[PDB]
Amino acid sequence: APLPQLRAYTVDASWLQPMAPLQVADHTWQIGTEDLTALLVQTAEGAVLLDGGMPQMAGHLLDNMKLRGVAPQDLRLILLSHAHADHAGPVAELKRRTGAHVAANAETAVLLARGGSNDLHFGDGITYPPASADRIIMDGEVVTVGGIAFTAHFMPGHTPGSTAWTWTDTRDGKPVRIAYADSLSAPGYQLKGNPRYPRLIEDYKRSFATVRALPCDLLLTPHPGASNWNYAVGSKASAEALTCNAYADAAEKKFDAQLARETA
Amino acid sequence: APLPQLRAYTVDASWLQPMAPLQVADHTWQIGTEDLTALLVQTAEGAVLLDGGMPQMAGHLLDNMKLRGVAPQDLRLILLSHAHADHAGPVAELKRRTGAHVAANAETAVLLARGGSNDLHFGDGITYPPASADRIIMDGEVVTVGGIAFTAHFMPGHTPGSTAWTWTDTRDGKPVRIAYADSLSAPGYQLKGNPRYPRLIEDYKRSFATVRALPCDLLLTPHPGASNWNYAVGSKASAEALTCNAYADAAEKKFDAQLARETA
Amino acid sequence: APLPQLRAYTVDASWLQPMAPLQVADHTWQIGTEDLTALLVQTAEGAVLLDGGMPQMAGHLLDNMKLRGVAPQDLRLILLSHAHADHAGPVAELKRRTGAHVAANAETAVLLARGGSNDLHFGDGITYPPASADRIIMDGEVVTVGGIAFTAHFMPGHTPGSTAWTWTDTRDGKPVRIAYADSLSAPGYQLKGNPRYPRLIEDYKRSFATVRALPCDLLLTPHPGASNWNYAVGSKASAEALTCNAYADAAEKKFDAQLARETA
Amino acid sequence: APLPQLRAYTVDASWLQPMAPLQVADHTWQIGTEDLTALLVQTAEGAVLLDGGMPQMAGHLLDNMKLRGVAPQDLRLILLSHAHADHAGPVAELKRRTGAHVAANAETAVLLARGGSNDLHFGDGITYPPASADRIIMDGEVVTVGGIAFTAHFMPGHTPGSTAWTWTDTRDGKPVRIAYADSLSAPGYQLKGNPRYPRLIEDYKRSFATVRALPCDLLLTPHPGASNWNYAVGSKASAEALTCNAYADAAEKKFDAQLARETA
Ligand SMILES: CO[C@@]1(NC(=O)[C@@H](C)C(=O)O)C(=O)N2C(C(=O)O)=C(C)CO[C@@H]21
Ligand SMILES: CO[C@@]1(NC(=O)[C@@H](C)C(=O)O)C(=O)N2C(C(=O)O)=C(C)CO[C@@H]21
Ligand SMILES: CO[C@@]1(NC(=O)[C@@H](C)C(=O)O)C(=O)N2C(C(=O)O)=C(C)CO[C@@H]21
Ligand SMILES: CO[C@@]1(NC(=O)[C@@H](C)C(=O)O)C(=O)N2C(C(=O)O)=C(C)CO[C@@H]21
Ligand SMILES: [Zn+2]
Ligand SMILES: [Zn+2]
Ligand SMILES: [Zn+2]
Ligand SMILES: [Zn+2]
Ligand SMILES: [Zn+2]
Ligand SMILES: [Zn+2]
Ligand SMILES: [Zn+2]
Ligand SMILES: [Zn+2]
């Protein structure tokens, strides 16, 4: 009776289904897969990448950047929603091949430093190549690349360092406020009495109110289904997209029902 | 046509076949599995562990230490042959649960810090939970725990930081010189003209002569088959064990034949 | 006209004035200097150290532990108030010489990892030997060593990872609730409109209310003058010590007057 | 009798004496001070910096890069001779302000990671802001930026990770082989029987022969006096510069006389 073999982190095939660069605004592009968000922001002084999806998506992201006329040495910054294998996966390979820097808060940096290992809820079941954050960011801090200002909004819950990013782009000259809000889900998390996360419920509740008050005209999430984005239809992808109020309100209802069932 | 799924590092079942603590000398014990070496050294001032095998062997190692009367807080040091997933796997979990420190050289420390990712030959196919080395060790440096002196011998080749450890134990009062020599194999390595490792052949050749001159009465290797150890038979495990000369000479012949076929 | 020479972090002589182990409770001891707190907690399963003061105090701390019958290998844990050079100074040297582990939150860990460099308010003027945190701690998490439970209380302000620690000791069988609250001062900090710390005022205000509600019978601070401790008189050191209410209330008044003068 | 105050790392004023960009070859520039080398290499695809001198020289280096028409975001790589405070000082500040990556070997990376603390010979007397190496380099590995190939040559001795860099530039179309060899000095080092560095003498001797065989037409050293460079005279700076043979031969004679006096 030998010890069990290691089991690989397998996902649905749609998470690894590549797609062409879908345009979100004048400078914002979706360059990930159909069910995983990876936002590219093109400025005059370089490019910014938000999330990267699964670790094996590193080659696909560079091809889309090549399609948008972005050389690897033009990627200047990498911002993260939260440092899980399905979002910060290819960060390590992207740093070695692009010369880009990574900005994250202390909680995301320490989770990124150990490659998702020793997760508060998943243990070591979702490991990915570790990377190091080059700039430590605080709540409400502004990061500027090529004139576009990125304001950080801490929304702890899914991970201790879950961060939502807001920036103002344009759509035919008219300004649009984009809000890339992180996941508000707790899949299989022990909500009450968790010794690894004692104030988990208080952080989720504060994060619900944080997402409601985000300056947002167009909302995006790491998993596009959470905000009803459908990258497959391309032109009509943002048709049924939720607001920040509707996204946080629906997430809180599923959180309260989940908390009530945990006490049962 | 989606991107490929991640594939888990799977090994032969004998590598994960637990065994009772086999005695090597008065203070040296084999507490790993049948085909993976994990040496425990009991002193009066604490315990020292050499290697740990696969990551999922962390629970098995603590049970054997419990069988030998070693509490988790008595493990004081963790020494490594080389920082691969099948040898330094459970190092991260052991540090969190035992309060032990890890001593390794700079090359093993940087490979251990990124959890085996970005391997010079395997890329990211053999990732394990990352750990941090607490003490950086040089070639020929002595580490002393409870009166037993551990001398490091750098033997680069399999990994840039492959290290052999020598210490003198006893067997019924009579001293015996133990040499835990690292692997001298190059499974699928590009030996000549490797841009990631330009002086690979020069390091292997120097490591062959290094193993021959090791002060050794009893030889052990991370994979027990490399030195003809058979942990299954227990009492007669060291019956057909090789010398340091025979181990390095056989490894060099397989290396030269492999190098000659690579040029073909 | 050459560039300026580096300037060393110099303090008042009383901060470096060694003292004998002063007893705070049955198991709690002050083993630092006269104007710098370094708390030693002796249990049956090991010892815990809270803060260490200046970097050059590493030799003095081990001598006091020797006076209390604590060998270097008995120090099991190192807890921190905040990772500044005058409190977490000798942490790096203590880890190499004691085999102890360090527990801190993500913000204290990243500041400890870069040795106090790139401080949000002091830049690189207060660098100390860097150390690595072995266990990442969350708000309200309990750390247990030898039966004594240490509960963490995040109180950001002086540093982003300022932490207060509470544990219950005894004094002749009678239980006493000890609260080691971190500094609530902001010496020369830009409080309003700080780009490195946008929500600085909101964190201080929340930390003021956090200290008021600490379960505390006896209060201690990293700088003993902040809570009116006088380690010099020894037996009557805790005579005029402040409560948690009086400490947080006085710190908030000095904070409000400082904020009002910054707007002037 | 209080503990001693910290003492700052003070150097001669000429080490901090700024100078205008002196031209070494078509693409190689000296942009450091008069007695500290900091080499800038301008290519079409970016710029490469070799060493940076003292930590307080970060502002001076960016001004010279501005004089050469190099924006901060054009510095792509930072190479190091060895990670001491007087050579790798401003590496941490340069990474935060330029978006550049650092390439070094494992021994230089671990010394750079702890900011020069716990030095094998100087202890903690020469601490500088810590930085992290982004790419780990092996002996003989080639690093290419903008068409210029940088070959690494390990020459351990002054530090365990001392590295010499060779690249081929031009001087009016004619190619010139530049060799930036690291220091071969051992100021106050215990050469024989050093427990922190057992094979110190064997590494110096091997490094002496390594420098002799460097492909070199023009030699440069971190301290320009070691190779008889005089940056002050500008146009005639390379007048009396030594060869690789003369530099290694003179360093070995001073090493042998120093070793013979240590035995006395
Ligand atoms: C670690 O990645 C996740 N978990 C998994 O993929 C497996 C392990 C699973 O839980 O089934 C995780 O958390 N995500 C989220 C999110 O909302 O962020 C949701 C909803 C589920 O998918 C990813
Ligand atoms: C990464 O671990 C190893 N490789 C594998 O397990 C797979 C990936 C494989 O190569 O088939 C590796 O190297 N080892 C050694 C050794 O001699 O050290 C040998 C001989 C083969 O087993 C382990
Ligand atoms: C970095 O250490 C401190 N600052 C200094 O020592 C110098 C630089 C200084 O500010 O004069 C710092 O902050 N402390 C505190 C505290 O309350 O924690 C107070 C009140 C002042 O002393 C230490
Ligand atoms: C740490 O920096 C050095 N040492 C000092 O600056 C002080 C501490 C000193 O030794 O007097 C060091 O080593 N260098 C070298 C070199 O050859 O690299 C020489 C010759 C001396 O200067 C620098
Ligand atoms: Zn997730
Ligand atoms: Zn997810
Ligand atoms: Zn291996
Ligand atoms: Zn192996
Ligand atoms: Zn402070
Ligand atoms: Zn202080
Ligand atoms: Zn030096
Ligand atoms: Zn020097």
PDB file of N, CA and C in Angstrom, chain A residues 1-13 16-18 33 54-57 60 93 96 113-115 117-118 124 127-130, chain B residues 1-13 16-18 33 54-57 60 93 96 113-115 117-118 124 127-130:
ATOM      1  N   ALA A   1       0.826  -1.202   0.000  1.00  0.00           N
ATOM      2  CA  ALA A   1       0.000   0.000   0.000  1.00  0.00           C
ATOM      3  C   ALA A   1       0.865   1.258   0.000  1.00  0.00           C
ATOM      4  N   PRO A   2       1.270   1.703  -1.184  1.00  0.00           N
ATOM      5  CA  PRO A   2       2.139   2.878  -1.285  1.00  0.00           C
ATOM      6  C   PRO A   2       1.372   4.176  -1.065  1.00  0.00           C
ATOM      7  N   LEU A   3       2.140   5.240  -0.843  1.00  0.00           N
ATOM      8  CA  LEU A   3       1.569   6.567  -0.694  1.00  0.00           C
ATOM      9  C   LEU A   3       0.934   7.021  -2.009  1.00  0.00           C
ATOM     10  N   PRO A   4      -0.058   7.908  -1.952  1.00  0.00           N
ATOM     11  CA  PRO A   4      -0.746   8.321  -3.179  1.00  0.00           C
ATOM     12  C   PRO A   4       0.144   9.162  -4.081  1.00  0.00           C
ATOM     13  N   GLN A   5      -0.115   9.060  -5.381  1.00  0.00           N
ATOM     14  CA  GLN A   5       0.608   9.861  -6.358  1.00  0.00           C
ATOM     15  C   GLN A   5       0.122  11.304  -6.331  1.00  0.00           C
ATOM     16  N   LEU A   6       0.994  12.213  -6.761  1.00  0.00           N
ATOM     17  CA  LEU A   6       0.599  13.608  -6.893  1.00  0.00           C
ATOM     18  C   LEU A   6      -0.466  13.747  -7.973  1.00  0.00           C
ATOM     19  N   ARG A   7      -1.406  14.662  -7.749  1.00  0.00           N
ATOM     20  CA  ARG A   7      -2.503  14.910  -8.673  1.00  0.00           C
ATOM     21  C   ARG A   7      -2.377  16.318  -9.235  1.00  0.00           C
ATOM     22  N   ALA A   8      -2.436  16.429 -10.558  1.00  0.00           N
ATOM     23  CA  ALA A   8      -2.251  17.708 -11.224  1.00  0.00           C
ATOM     24  C   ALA A   8      -3.522  18.546 -11.165  1.00  0.00           C
ATOM     25  N   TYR A   9      -3.334  19.861 -11.121  1.00  0.00           N
ATOM     26  CA  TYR A   9      -4.440  20.814 -11.093  1.00  0.00           C
ATOM     27  C   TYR A   9      -5.060  20.888 -12.482  1.00  0.00           C
ATOM     28  N   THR A  10      -6.177  20.190 -12.672  1.00  0.00           N
ATOM     29  CA  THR A  10      -6.874  20.145 -13.949  1.00  0.00           C
ATOM     30  C   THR A  10      -8.131  21.001 -13.881  1.00  0.00           C
ATOM     31  N   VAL A  11      -8.427  21.695 -14.978  1.00  0.00           N
ATOM     32  CA  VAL A  11      -9.540  22.626 -15.058  1.00  0.00           C
ATOM     33  C   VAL A  11     -10.410  22.249 -16.253  1.00  0.00           C
ATOM     34  N   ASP A  12     -11.501  22.990 -16.429  1.00  0.00           N
ATOM     35  CA  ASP A  12     -12.350  22.793 -17.594  1.00  0.00           C
ATOM     36  C   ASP A  12     -11.629  23.261 -18.853  1.00  0.00           C
ATOM     37  N   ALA A  13     -11.955  22.617 -19.978  1.00  0.00           N
ATOM     38  CA  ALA A  13     -11.243  22.893 -21.222  1.00  0.00           C
ATOM     39  C   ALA A  13     -11.445  24.329 -21.688  1.00  0.00           C
ATOM     40  N   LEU A  16      -8.748  26.844 -20.884  1.00  0.00           N
ATOM     41  CA  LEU A  16      -7.546  26.770 -21.703  1.00  0.00           C
ATOM     42  C   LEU A  16      -7.853  26.914 -23.189  1.00  0.00           C
ATOM     43  N   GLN A  17      -9.002  27.494 -23.531  1.00  0.00           N
ATOM     44  CA  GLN A  17      -9.408  27.666 -24.919  1.00  0.00           C
ATOM     45  C   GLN A  17      -8.945  29.027 -25.426  1.00  0.00           C
ATOM     46  N   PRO A  18      -7.884  29.081 -26.228  1.00  0.00           N
ATOM     47  CA  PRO A  18      -7.332  30.375 -26.643  1.00  0.00           C
ATOM     48  C   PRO A  18      -8.308  31.157 -27.510  1.00  0.00           C
ATOM     49  N   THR A  33      -7.971  33.536 -22.396  1.00  0.00           N
ATOM     50  CA  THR A  33      -8.794  32.491 -22.982  1.00  0.00           C
ATOM     51  C   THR A  33     -10.269  32.875 -22.870  1.00  0.00           C
ATOM     52  N   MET A  54      -3.743  30.445 -16.374  1.00  0.00           N
ATOM     53  CA  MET A  54      -3.054  29.210 -16.038  1.00  0.00           C
ATOM     54  C   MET A  54      -1.575  29.297 -16.403  1.00  0.00           C
ATOM     55  N   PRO A  55      -0.725  28.501 -15.745  1.00  0.00           N
ATOM     56  CA  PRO A  55       0.715  28.561 -16.048  1.00  0.00           C
ATOM     57  C   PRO A  55       1.054  28.237 -17.492  1.00  0.00           C
ATOM     58  N   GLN A  56       0.318  27.327 -18.129  1.00  0.00           N
ATOM     59  CA  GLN A  56       0.607  26.924 -19.500  1.00  0.00           C
ATOM     60  C   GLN A  56       0.099  27.921 -20.538  1.00  0.00           C
ATOM     61  N   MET A  57      -0.376  29.090 -20.114  1.00  0.00           N
ATOM     62  CA  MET A  57      -0.853  30.122 -21.025  1.00  0.00           C
ATOM     63  C   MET A  57       0.212  31.161 -21.354  1.00  0.00           C
ATOM     64  N   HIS A  60       0.695  31.618 -25.112  1.00  0.00           N
ATOM     65  CA  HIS A  60      -0.456  32.227 -25.769  1.00  0.00           C
ATOM     66  C   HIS A  60      -0.508  33.730 -25.525  1.00  0.00           C
ATOM     67  N   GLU A  93       7.198  32.686 -15.658  1.00  0.00           N
ATOM     68  CA  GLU A  93       7.752  32.565 -17.002  1.00  0.00           C
ATOM     69  C   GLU A  93       7.700  33.890 -17.751  1.00  0.00           C
ATOM     70  N   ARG A  96      10.741  36.171 -16.786  1.00  0.00           N
ATOM     71  CA  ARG A  96      12.018  35.785 -17.375  1.00  0.00           C
ATOM     72  C   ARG A  96      12.095  36.144 -18.853  1.00  0.00           C
ATOM     73  N   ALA A 113       5.321  34.399  -3.694  1.00  0.00           N
ATOM     74  CA  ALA A 113       6.702  33.992  -3.459  1.00  0.00           C
ATOM     75  C   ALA A 113       6.821  32.491  -3.230  1.00  0.00           C
ATOM     76  N   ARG A 114       5.807  31.867  -2.631  1.00  0.00           N
ATOM     77  CA  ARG A 114       5.819  30.429  -2.407  1.00  0.00           C
ATOM     78  C   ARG A 114       4.971  29.678  -3.428  1.00  0.00           C
ATOM     79  N   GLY A 115       4.655  30.314  -4.553  1.00  0.00           N
ATOM     80  CA  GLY A 115       4.014  29.622  -5.663  1.00  0.00           C
ATOM     81  C   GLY A 115       2.658  29.035  -5.346  1.00  0.00           C
ATOM     82  N   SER A 117       1.744  27.604  -2.715  1.00  0.00           N
ATOM     83  CA  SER A 117       1.799  26.524  -1.744  1.00  0.00           C
ATOM     84  C   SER A 117       1.357  27.022  -0.371  1.00  0.00           C
ATOM     85  N   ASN A 118       1.009  26.068   0.494  1.00  0.00           N
ATOM     86  CA  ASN A 118       0.533  26.362   1.846  1.00  0.00           C
ATOM     87  C   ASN A 118      -0.639  27.341   1.813  1.00  0.00           C
ATOM     88  N   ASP A 124      -1.496  22.485  -0.473  1.00  0.00           N
ATOM     89  CA  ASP A 124      -0.505  22.446  -1.543  1.00  0.00           C
ATOM     90  C   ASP A 124      -1.069  21.859  -2.830  1.00  0.00           C
ATOM     91  N   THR A 127      -0.191  24.307  -6.706  1.00  0.00           N
ATOM     92  CA  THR A 127       1.121  24.931  -6.792  1.00  0.00           C
ATOM     93  C   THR A 127       1.410  25.365  -8.225  1.00  0.00           C
ATOM     94  N   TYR A 128       2.125  26.474  -8.356  1.00  0.00           N
ATOM     95  CA  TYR A 128       2.565  26.995  -9.641  1.00  0.00           C
ATOM     96  C   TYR A 128       3.962  27.569  -9.468  1.00  0.00           C
ATOM     97  N   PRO A 129       4.701  27.754 -10.565  1.00  0.00           N
ATOM     98  CA  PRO A 129       6.058  28.313 -10.466  1.00  0.00           C
ATOM     99  C   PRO A 129       6.069  29.620  -9.700  1.00  0.00           C
ATOM    100  N   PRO A 130       6.904  29.727  -8.670  1.00  0.00           N
ATOM    101  CA  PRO A 130       6.902  30.932  -7.836  1.00  0.00           C
ATOM    102  C   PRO A 130       7.564  32.108  -8.533  1.00  0.00           C
TER     103      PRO A 130
ATOM    104  N   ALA B   1      -9.485  23.358 -29.956  1.00  0.00           N
ATOM    105  CA  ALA B   1      -8.184  22.819 -29.576  1.00  0.00           C
ATOM    106  C   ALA B   1      -7.589  23.600 -28.406  1.00  0.00           C
ATOM    107  N   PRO B   2      -7.951  23.216 -27.188  1.00  0.00           N
ATOM    108  CA  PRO B   2      -7.467  23.930 -26.003  1.00  0.00           C
ATOM    109  C   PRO B   2      -6.020  23.583 -25.678  1.00  0.00           C
ATOM    110  N   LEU B   3      -5.435  24.410 -24.815  1.00  0.00           N
ATOM    111  CA  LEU B   3      -4.083  24.173 -24.339  1.00  0.00           C
ATOM    112  C   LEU B   3      -4.035  22.900 -23.494  1.00  0.00           C
ATOM    113  N   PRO B   4      -2.880  22.240 -23.420  1.00  0.00           N
ATOM    114  CA  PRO B   4      -2.800  20.977 -22.681  1.00  0.00           C
ATOM    115  C   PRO B   4      -2.944  21.180 -21.181  1.00  0.00           C
ATOM    116  N   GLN B   5      -3.488  20.160 -20.524  1.00  0.00           N
ATOM    117  CA  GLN B   5      -3.621  20.182 -19.075  1.00  0.00           C
ATOM    118  C   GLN B   5      -2.271  19.945 -18.410  1.00  0.00           C
ATOM    119  N   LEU B   6      -2.144  20.433 -17.178  1.00  0.00           N
ATOM    120  CA  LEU B   6      -0.943  20.165 -16.400  1.00  0.00           C
ATOM    121  C   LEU B   6      -0.843  18.676 -16.095  1.00  0.00           C
ATOM    122  N   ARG B   7       0.384  18.164 -16.088  1.00  0.00           N
ATOM    123  CA  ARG B   7       0.651  16.756 -15.829  1.00  0.00           C
ATOM    124  C   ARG B   7       1.440  16.626 -14.535  1.00  0.00           C
ATOM    125  N   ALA B   8       0.963  15.765 -13.641  1.00  0.00           N
ATOM    126  CA  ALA B   8       1.578  15.604 -12.334  1.00  0.00           C
ATOM    127  C   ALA B   8       2.820  14.725 -12.416  1.00  0.00           C
ATOM    128  N   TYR B   9       3.778  15.013 -11.541  1.00  0.00           N
ATOM    129  CA  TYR B   9       5.023  14.252 -11.459  1.00  0.00           C
ATOM    130  C   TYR B   9       4.736  12.911 -10.796  1.00  0.00           C
ATOM    131  N   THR B  10       4.603  11.864 -11.607  1.00  0.00           N
ATOM    132  CA  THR B  10       4.308  10.523 -11.125  1.00  0.00           C
ATOM    133  C   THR B  10       5.562   9.661 -11.197  1.00  0.00           C
ATOM    134  N   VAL B  11       5.743   8.808 -10.190  1.00  0.00           N
ATOM    135  CA  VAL B  11       6.925   7.973 -10.056  1.00  0.00           C
ATOM    136  C   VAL B  11       6.485   6.519  -9.910  1.00  0.00           C
ATOM    137  N   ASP B  12       7.466   5.625  -9.822  1.00  0.00           N
ATOM    138  CA  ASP B  12       7.170   4.223  -9.574  1.00  0.00           C
ATOM    139  C   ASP B  12       6.653   4.039  -8.152  1.00  0.00           C
ATOM    140  N   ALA B  13       5.795   3.030  -7.976  1.00  0.00           N
ATOM    141  CA  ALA B  13       5.139   2.832  -6.687  1.00  0.00           C
ATOM    142  C   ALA B  13       6.137   2.508  -5.583  1.00  0.00           C
ATOM    143  N   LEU B  16       7.256   5.323  -3.330  1.00  0.00           N
ATOM    144  CA  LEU B  16       6.300   5.741  -2.314  1.00  0.00           C
ATOM    145  C   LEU B  16       5.885   4.589  -1.406  1.00  0.00           C
ATOM    146  N   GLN B  17       6.693   3.533  -1.338  1.00  0.00           N
ATOM    147  CA  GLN B  17       6.388   2.367  -0.518  1.00  0.00           C
ATOM    148  C   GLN B  17       7.015   2.528   0.861  1.00  0.00           C
ATOM    149  N   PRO B  18       6.229   2.859   1.884  1.00  0.00           N
ATOM    150  CA  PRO B  18       6.805   3.141   3.203  1.00  0.00           C
ATOM    151  C   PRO B  18       7.459   1.910   3.812  1.00  0.00           C
ATOM    152  N   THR B  33      11.439   5.563   2.157  1.00  0.00           N
ATOM    153  CA  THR B  33      10.731   4.467   1.516  1.00  0.00           C
ATOM    154  C   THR B  33      11.733   3.424   1.026  1.00  0.00           C
ATOM    155  N   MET B  54       9.846  12.334  -1.754  1.00  0.00           N
ATOM    156  CA  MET B  54       8.731  12.973  -2.432  1.00  0.00           C
ATOM    157  C   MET B  54       7.980  13.903  -1.484  1.00  0.00           C
ATOM    158  N   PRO B  55       7.277  14.905  -2.024  1.00  0.00           N
ATOM    159  CA  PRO B  55       6.550  15.841  -1.149  1.00  0.00           C
ATOM    160  C   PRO B  55       5.504  15.177  -0.272  1.00  0.00           C
ATOM    161  N   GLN B  56       4.839  14.130  -0.758  1.00  0.00           N
ATOM    162  CA  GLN B  56       3.786  13.466   0.001  1.00  0.00           C
ATOM    163  C   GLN B  56       4.324  12.510   1.063  1.00  0.00           C
ATOM    164  N   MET B  57       5.633  12.506   1.307  1.00  0.00           N
ATOM    165  CA  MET B  57       6.240  11.657   2.323  1.00  0.00           C
ATOM    166  C   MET B  57       6.429  12.369   3.656  1.00  0.00           C
ATOM    167  N   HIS B  60       4.894  10.443   6.572  1.00  0.00           N
ATOM    168  CA  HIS B  60       5.585   9.191   6.861  1.00  0.00           C
ATOM    169  C   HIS B  60       6.886   9.432   7.617  1.00  0.00           C
ATOM    170  N   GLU B  93       7.056  21.481   4.060  1.00  0.00           N
ATOM    171  CA  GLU B  93       6.118  21.064   5.096  1.00  0.00           C
ATOM    172  C   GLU B  93       6.837  20.671   6.380  1.00  0.00           C
ATOM    173  N   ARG B  96       7.692  23.833   8.536  1.00  0.00           N
ATOM    174  CA  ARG B  96       6.563  24.426   9.243  1.00  0.00           C
ATOM    175  C   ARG B  96       6.149  23.596  10.452  1.00  0.00           C
ATOM    176  N   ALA B 113      14.555  27.622  -3.400  1.00  0.00           N
ATOM    177  CA  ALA B 113      13.731  28.807  -3.189  1.00  0.00           C
ATOM    178  C   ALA B 113      12.614  28.913  -4.218  1.00  0.00           C
ATOM    179  N   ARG B 114      12.845  28.444  -5.444  1.00  0.00           N
ATOM    180  CA  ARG B 114      11.822  28.469  -6.478  1.00  0.00           C
ATOM    181  C   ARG B 114      11.158  27.109  -6.668  1.00  0.00           C
ATOM    182  N   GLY B 115      11.291  26.217  -5.690  1.00  0.00           N
ATOM    183  CA  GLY B 115      10.543  24.967  -5.692  1.00  0.00           C
ATOM    184  C   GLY B 115      10.829  24.059  -6.867  1.00  0.00           C
ATOM    185  N   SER B 117      11.295  24.865  -9.857  1.00  0.00           N
ATOM    186  CA  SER B 117      10.863  25.419 -11.129  1.00  0.00           C
ATOM    187  C   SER B 117      12.059  25.973 -11.899  1.00  0.00           C
ATOM    188  N   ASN B 118      11.858  26.160 -13.204  1.00  0.00           N
ATOM    189  CA  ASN B 118      12.900  26.657 -14.102  1.00  0.00           C
ATOM    190  C   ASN B 118      14.166  25.810 -13.993  1.00  0.00           C
ATOM    191  N   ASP B 124       9.751  23.301 -15.932  1.00  0.00           N
ATOM    192  CA  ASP B 124       8.804  23.402 -14.826  1.00  0.00           C
ATOM    193  C   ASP B 124       8.024  22.110 -14.616  1.00  0.00           C
ATOM    194  N   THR B 127       7.810  20.590 -10.208  1.00  0.00           N
ATOM    195  CA  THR B 127       7.675  21.610  -9.180  1.00  0.00           C
ATOM    196  C   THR B 127       7.245  20.980  -7.859  1.00  0.00           C
ATOM    197  N   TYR B 128       7.732  21.550  -6.765  1.00  0.00           N
ATOM    198  CA  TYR B 128       7.370  21.136  -5.419  1.00  0.00           C
ATOM    199  C   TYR B 128       7.273  22.380  -4.549  1.00  0.00           C
ATOM    200  N   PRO B 129       6.599  22.286  -3.399  1.00  0.00           N
ATOM    201  CA  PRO B 129       6.477  23.452  -2.510  1.00  0.00           C
ATOM    202  C   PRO B 129       7.830  24.050  -2.183  1.00  0.00           C
ATOM    203  N   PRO B 130       8.002  25.350  -2.406  1.00  0.00           N
ATOM    204  CA  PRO B 130       9.311  25.972  -2.193  1.00  0.00           C
ATOM    205  C   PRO B 130       9.621  26.154  -0.716  1.00  0.00           C
TER     206      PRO B 130
END
